[PDB]
Every structure is written in C-alpha cells, then in structure tokens.
C-alpha cells in the first residue's frame, strides 16, 4: 500500500519489511528480490515476484487492486521502474515473462 510508496520515494538500503508485505506469492522470493535489486536472471527467471508469474495464489493478493505501487512517488529510474512494473504492475497473471522466465510452479499455501 502507500507505505510501500513511502519507502520507494527513498530506496536508502534494502529494507525487505514493504518487500515482505508485497509479495503476493513465496516470502523467499521477495527476499531475492530485495536483496539483488533487478540485478539476477534467477530474480526475474526462476524465484521472485508473486502470482503475477507464478502458476498458484498465496496468503497475500497482487497489490494491483487493493494497494498502491505504481510509479507516483517513485523517482524516475527507468531500468527500477521497468521491473517493478514487470512483477507488481503485470496484467497477465499466472505465466507469462517478460525479461526473463516464469516457472509454473505449483504452490499450496493453506486451503
């Protein structure tokens, strides 16, 4: 939601908290993600983002909705803004890459 737009407007270090918040999918693969910062093929290729790739849907939704994570209070760097948009800002949910590759693993959170 706007706390992760609050963060965002000053990416200091690599504080994973929004990060760990956000990911509508796998903890341990936003923790990849926070950690690396776009800079991994196995980031956008093998364990990151959420359902927006991934072939199942966890606890935690795609922000798309009921939050807040488009480019608003973001500073503009386009390579950070093209993959953030790549993982949250994705239309097709469920497959489909766009840099690197989406696995279609199957993941049951809860029933």
């Known amino acids: 939601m706007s706390w992760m737009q609050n963060l965002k407007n000053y990416q200091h270090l690599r504080d994973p908290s929004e990060y760990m918040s956000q990911v509508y999918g796998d903890p341990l693969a ?3 993600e926070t950690t690396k910062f ?3 093929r196995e980031y956008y290729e093998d364990f990151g983002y959420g ?3 991934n072939s199942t849907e966890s606890e935690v939704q795609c922000e798309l909705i009921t939050g807040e ?3 608003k209070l973001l500073p503009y760097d386009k390579r950070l803004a093209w993959h953030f948009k ?3 800002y994705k ?3 469920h497959g489909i890459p766009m840099i690197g590759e989406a696995p279609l693993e199957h993941h049951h959170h809860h029933h």
Do not use: H, K, R
Request: negative net charge; charged residues 20%.
């Open 69 to 71: 994570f488009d480019p």
């Open 51 to 53: 359902e927006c790739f």
């Open 30 to 32: 936003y923790l990849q």
């Open 91 to 93: 239309t097709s949910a």
């Open 38 to 40: 776009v800079t991994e």
């Open 86 to 88: 790549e993982f949250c």
